[PDB]
Structure 1
Amino acid sequence: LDVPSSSRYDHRIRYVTYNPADVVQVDTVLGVATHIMLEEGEQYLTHAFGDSEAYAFARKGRHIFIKPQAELANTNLIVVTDRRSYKFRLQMRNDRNGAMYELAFRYPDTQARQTREANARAAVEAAFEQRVGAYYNLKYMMSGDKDIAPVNAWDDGRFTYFKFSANADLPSIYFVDAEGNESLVPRTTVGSSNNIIAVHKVNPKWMIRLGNRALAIFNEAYDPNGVPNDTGTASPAVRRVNKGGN
């Protein structure tokens, strides 16, 4: 018998916290329709009254509308869903006072889940933005058509960044291997004014092409060892964990 507690504004609206091993007090007065609301996305499977004539039942998804229709309507409603089963003991009140207009359920486990996700998301964003413990390489040299040149190039050990001025078109940047073969490398455009192209690799030689002009960028302090990617993300302060399980 989980007798619930009322709201702070109207005693007609009364909240109860679900418990799989206890039943719920509902006091129904004559002429009022009580609303029992399910958790969002929950699918109604089967319901069962004690006296199916005593109470009137209407359902629209997760909104269940109930109503008395006979004297001494003291029965129970057991509505079962895919997730849980609800347990009521409907006792009619004689003097038409202390009605309930809707019942609300509080789910400790769902709240504990969804509150964790928001905090974790805020922490993750803070961790990405913190961006500490980084070493920068600035020993980059270029030779070729200096009219497509970046104003600055550097790498942080994981990505390589090319910074372009505001009046310069953004060119294509290619991956040059040992034999001089160019090949595609994925790039993301970062920066406030989209002036930086971040390629997702550290390499000793790069090739910059725009139209019919070519520029060669050389990494003059190439570190073959690099720094390992133990976390699965672009930063060492955010782990990528396996959610799908399975």
Structure 2
Amino acid sequence: AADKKRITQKLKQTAFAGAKNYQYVMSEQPEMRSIQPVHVWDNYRFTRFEFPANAELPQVYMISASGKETLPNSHVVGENRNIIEVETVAKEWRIRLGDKVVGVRNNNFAPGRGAVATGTASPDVRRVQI
């Protein structure tokens, strides 16, 4: 319904959950450091990189297992809207932007396990074919 959807959609906003990985390590360059993030975290590959007002907008990419680089399909989200939610696999992440080039590392491996069936993007909501 109109109101059925609504309630649900809110449910869907909040799903940056599961047991997160708390530690991301980053690089550190005197140029990088400056325009660094606020908080960057993950539970999945669905990773959030929040930004301060006064922190530039990098462009970040993922390092697939190939080791070679790739570009993630990302988006930013938030009331803050600053954060960039990326929806592609990768441990590391580069965070280029012209000369400069950071590269936060994600740091978790529960290997060989993790897969389930979300059943949408975020598990809150669901797909009930039409």
TM range (shorter): 0.7 to 0.9
Structure 2 counterpart of 1:231, one-letter code: G
- Greater C-alpha radius of gyration: 1
Residue 8 (structure 2) pairs with residue 121 (structure 1)? no
Paired position in structure 1 for 2:18: 134
Q: Give ranges in structure 2 of 5+ residues lacking alignment.
A: none
Superposed displacement of residue 157, structure 1: 2.3
Query: Does the aligned pair in 1 maintain the 2:22–2:42 contact within 8 Å?
Result: yes
Query: Does the aligned pair in 2 maintain the 1:174–1:206 contact within 8 Å?
Result: yes
Provide TM-score, normalisation by structure 2: 0.80
Paired position in structure 2 for 1:160: 47
CA, structure 1 residues 192+220, in 2 after alignment: closer, same or farther (shift >3 Å)? same
- 1:72-97 Cα offsets, whole Å, 9 max, x none, are xxxxxxxxxxxxxxxxxxxxxxxxxx
Query: Does the aligned pair in 1 maintain the 2:65–2:90 contact within 8 Å?
Result: no
Query: Does the aligned pair in 2 maintain the 1:150–1:164 contact within 8 Å?
Result: yes
Which residue of 210, 219, 229 maps to 2:106?
A: 219
Paired position in structure 1 for 2:74: 187
Paired position in structure 1 for 2:117: 229
- 1:124-147 Cα offsets, whole Å, 9 max, x none, are 224324548622211110114323
Residue 127 (structure 2) pairs with residue 240 (structure 1)? yes
Which residue of 55, 60, 73 maps to 1:173?
A: 60
- 1:25-70 Cα offsets, whole Å, 9 max, x none, are xxxxxxxxxxxxxxxxxxxxxxxxxxxxxxxxxxxxxxxxxxxxxx
Distance 1:168 1:150 in 2: 7
Structure 1 counterpart of 2:116, one-letter code: P
Q: Give ranges in structure 1 of 5+ residues lacking alignment.
A: 1-116
Structure 1 counterpart of 2:117, one-letter code: N
Matches within 5 A, 1:45-194: 117-129=1-13, 131=15, 134-144=18-28, 145-194=32-81
Distance 1:132 1:146 in 2: 25
Distance 2:12 2:66 in 1: 37
Distance 2:89 2:128 in 1: 25
In the TM superposition, structure 1's runs of 4+ consecutive aligned residues that sit over 4 Å from their partners are none
Distance 2:16 2:106 in 1: 23
RMSD, aligned CA: 2.3
CA, structure 1 residues 130+162, in 2 after alignment: closer, same or farther (shift >3 Å)? closer
- Count residues in correspondence: 126
More strand by share: 1
Secondary structure of 2:104's aligned partner: strand
The percent of aligned pairs where both chains have the same amino acid is 36
Superposed displacement of residue 175, structure 1: 1.0
Secondary structure of 2:60's aligned partner: strand
Paired position in structure 2 for 1:79: none
